[PDB]
Amino acid sequence: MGNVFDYEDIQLIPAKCIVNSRSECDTTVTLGKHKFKLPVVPANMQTIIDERIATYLAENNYFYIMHRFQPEKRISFIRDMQSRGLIASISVGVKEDEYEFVQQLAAEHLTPEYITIDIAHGHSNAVINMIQHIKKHLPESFVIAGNVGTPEAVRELENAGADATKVGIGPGKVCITKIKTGFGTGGWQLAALRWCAKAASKPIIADGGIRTNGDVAKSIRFGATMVMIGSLFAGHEESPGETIEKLYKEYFGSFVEHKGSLEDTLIEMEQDLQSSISYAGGTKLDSIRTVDYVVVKNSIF
Amino acid sequence: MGNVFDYEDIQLIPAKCIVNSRSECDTTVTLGKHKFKLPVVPANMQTIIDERIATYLAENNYFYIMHRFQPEKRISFIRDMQSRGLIASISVGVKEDEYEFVQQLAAEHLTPEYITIDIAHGHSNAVINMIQHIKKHLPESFVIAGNVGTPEAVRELENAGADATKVGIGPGKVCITKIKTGFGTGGWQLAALRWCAKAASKPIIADGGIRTNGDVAKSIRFGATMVMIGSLFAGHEESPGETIEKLYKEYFGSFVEHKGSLEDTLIEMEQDLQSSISYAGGTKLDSIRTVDYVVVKNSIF
Amino acid sequence: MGNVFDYEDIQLIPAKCIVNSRSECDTTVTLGKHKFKLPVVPANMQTIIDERIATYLAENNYFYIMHRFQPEKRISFIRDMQSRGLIASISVGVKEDEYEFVQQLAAEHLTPEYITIDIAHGHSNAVINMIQHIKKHLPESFVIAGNVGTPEAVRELENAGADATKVGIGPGKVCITKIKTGFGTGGWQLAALRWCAKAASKPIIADGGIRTNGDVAKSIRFGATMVMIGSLFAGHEESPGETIEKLYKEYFGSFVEHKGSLEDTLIEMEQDLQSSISYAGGTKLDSIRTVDYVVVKNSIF
Amino acid sequence: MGNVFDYEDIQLIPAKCIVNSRSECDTTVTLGKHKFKLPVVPANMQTIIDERIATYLAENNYFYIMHRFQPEKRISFIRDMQSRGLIASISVGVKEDEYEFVQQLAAEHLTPEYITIDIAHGHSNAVINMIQHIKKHLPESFVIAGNVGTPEAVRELENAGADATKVGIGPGKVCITKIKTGFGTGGWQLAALRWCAKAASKPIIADGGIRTNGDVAKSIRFGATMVMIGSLFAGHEESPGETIEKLYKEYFGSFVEHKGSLEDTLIEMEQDLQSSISYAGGTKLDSIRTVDYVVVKNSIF
Ligand SMILES: Nc1nc2c(ncn2[C@@H]2O[C@@H](COP(=O)(O)O)[C@@H](O)[C@H]2O)c(=O)[nH]1
Ligand SMILES: Nc1nc2c(ncn2[C@@H]2O[C@@H](COP(=O)(O)O)[C@@H](O)[C@H]2O)c(=O)[nH]1
């Protein structure tokens, strides 16, 4: 950064197709010691993810991150997921009984595979301290830290010991940080990603702003390992929240229209993303990383 | 490419008018051994073209390309069109009984004047192979190959032996490749054309993105020999698809409003295009190629 | 040209106000041997101007140009206007009985004060010929020629003997030349004016694209002597066309909402334009010519 | 200026958060001899402010400026506010019985703490004269002068003796100066502020264009001491004007929807602005001044 742009400004340029069917394209990705079907993860929000969803995903090799909204239920969540041969992926804060939470986890001999320290303005000593604290008590837990919007936050989190950082400050559909405060990556998420990624030693989770499945490929182009999606996963039948009636579900953070089975959404993502690999002139996800691109004048639209 | 822009960004600059009536302007063009009334061709899609339309066009020296959706009907289509003193212009794929199709055509002593190898991502060995195959079995067939979106695809198709290439990856009104995959010329079709054309030895068919008849002239400015149009030819009385009721027709690929006779559309195209030649300070189509232009800031609109 | 922009891109920068009331600002302008209240003129179209309006304007020192749509009525129009102590301002073409029209005028000893040769694509020998013809038969007639969109057309018309040129190719609200042909100053009228004006020895009439009264001042900034307005003068009670019923009038060239008395419109123009002179740090119209300006990013709006 | 942009083009870049709660951020500011809760002030317009509001604000250490619309009521307004242990902040003009108004104030031994000379086009000798006049008769009155839109107006007002200048020419929601005259900072207010501020020795009040509370922080970034807000303060229950019925209030200068208590609005401003300080990596308002920023391509939206 550089020129500033966002998802809709970007068109990726096709290379020579080397496959006969998109079916020969592999969209898996790896994050620490584990391998997942898709580079996407639903937002770790109560309006998007619950234990039911978490189990479905885990049982099918989809990465998931559980929200933190009922912090008391986490211990037994971990234990359920882990007795099940499944990954336990949870979120923590830094305020303040969760310092003894991760200490209780150590005593309980309970190591979650993934822990995400998820704070609105995650560029802080508060976040550094919780990272160090977890590397100390649960050194075998893969730690995702954020949210951040700069290369400088990314470095300083990675230097605190984060295994991955989460990038995005206010680009969410239901997020209003840009309006209230005038700060963040809203309006330039994809470019804020190019630029954080340039400086990252650890996987980045691009968080927020995704409006189409093509934006997964674009996020891949510009440095993401994983893409967090709230809006596009909102309003499925499996989704949290009640349904009204045609047909609608609420979606909010800490009014949409009904979308069908989350599995159809996920297979469609995978298919679109395999088309993306065809277009990127390759067989796997990483082929996307090398393609040229143009910044269009009006949009995509 | 260069600056990226699209049809609506472009205004062409008028030269001194050398005609008294647009009627003295000639909009014909030539593609291989044949001469046509207009540099336009309806999309080779089942929602746009059928044998009825194909016959009308052919009988009136309008270039047409037939879709491939009932591949069994092609043989007798060719034979009908050819017993009629008319051009037989068909589409083929590369999967897989159509390798013996063009071999059956050779045995049948049936040479179609035009064959279009029409694949979404036509930059592939698959397409190269079908080109070579046809140059081998039906060497007297003019071969149009695509679709492509780069100078590199254009060269490599032309080097495989294509007589013309079709340029456009996702700029169609009903096309969703840009949304699903994040790849292609959608949002910058006209510039993707300037740039493919710069590197082409063979006629290019600019395929997709045309929203006004002025965009035909613009496509001419930027290197097209021929312009393929789906949307603007959708929904005529002669058009495929049923009519509802006011008055509508469906338009889709592999919900519009009713447009009148296709002949009125075509005479209007010709007239607008003769106005375009008046403005280009000339008497024929090629006068458009030399005019200056500006990229406006907001649009045309 | 230079950077391309249009009316809405432009903000003019205020200089020190040297007046106590906008009332001390003089918005008059001169075109040949005559002095007018405002640098504006209604479009010389049948949907905008008739003899009733023409008389009102003339009787109040507003410049007007009469349309050509009933060419038989012109002779007696001139004579009426001229027996009245009023300016006779008419439009002519070049096809073809109007070569003897201006010859009939010579015989009739009838010299119109202003004659406008008004052709869509006025950059032509056709227009040059009619200019020379009029300078020959009615040498005392002020000749306005056009329409043009380039410095080159402006020079060549001025060299043919035009006393003023009319600039604008398709920026009209009801004009569709940009859509049909892909040619003209639509989308960049104000910049097409900066640029024609840079090369002009004669007054330019900026014709078309005016959407607000501020655009009169902007046209002044960028070189106009006079501004032709169709849309903003459409739909007044005095205006041509019938009224329906709330309340509407048609507006078209060769569906709006009702606007009130044309005199209120004209006094308001004058007042806004005197505000413009206050802001331009002056007392007269020409003060506008010297102000700085910025090209904004989104619009004015 | 420089690149031209406005509030929606701008995203501010977060620095390392050094607070645990936005509650530890101080949003106070000082203007002359007085200290206020927020860098915001409601527009000194009759549709926004009255004595009731003025008293509320003053009694709670919110800066306010009273409009001038009932000039006869000012004397006793000052006296009421001043007998109350409250700041008396009034507006004056330059026409013409207000030269003896400020002379009557001197005789009455009535010194208003703040006086704002509030003229549409305030770059004038008229404004200079009233400034000098007040510095002469009421030298202990803090004088705010404007409105202006250039560094040159700012200097010349500050050189006349202004204690602060008010910046903004036509960016108001209900302002139509941009449409009528084609002049001012509408469409580029925030950049017109960067640029006036660069040349200012005195506090600037950024006046107009604020659409979100984030735009307060942005105005801070670009040089404002104080931000005047009309639109966002329109339509509260305490607000001037009648209510209709759901629920609406009028808002106009010299049709909205009902907004709630002005105190909720003001506490929310303060809270958003403390979030802004968290994001700016600081504890006080001035931390905002140092942050980086990007100009996005489409908007914020
Ligand atoms: N600042 C803020 N961000 C939120 C909130 N709720 C969700 N988000 C952000 O946006 C979500 C995903 O964004 P989306 O895919 O809908 O654009 C989450 O991953 C999170 O980063 C909220 O209440 N406040
Ligand atoms: N990728 C894709 N392209 C299509 C489809 N249907 C039509 N098209 C493209 O768009 C058509 C013409 O575009 P239009 O004139 O409507 O913008 C065809 O010529 C073809 O290139 C489809 O189903 N998928």
Ligand SMILES: Nc1nc2c(ncn2[C@@H]2O[C@@H](COP(=O)(O)O)[C@@H](O)[C@H]2O)c(=O)[nH]1
């Ligand atoms: N090409 C074309 N231009 C027209 C037509 N009718 C009006 N105009 C142009 O536009 C008018 C004024 O434009 P407006 O103020 O509405 O933007 C006339 O002065 C003329 O230049 C038409 O039918 N065709």
Ligand SMILES: Nc1nc2c(ncn2[C@@H]2O[C@@H](COP(=O)(O)O)[C@@H](O)[C@H]2O)c(=O)[nH]1
């Ligand atoms: N020129 C002009 N400006 C006005 C008028 N009424 C309000 N304003 C301006 O706009 C107000 C605030 O703008 P807002 O916050 O609504 O964008 C006032 O502070 C003032 O500068 C008016 O009638 N004419």
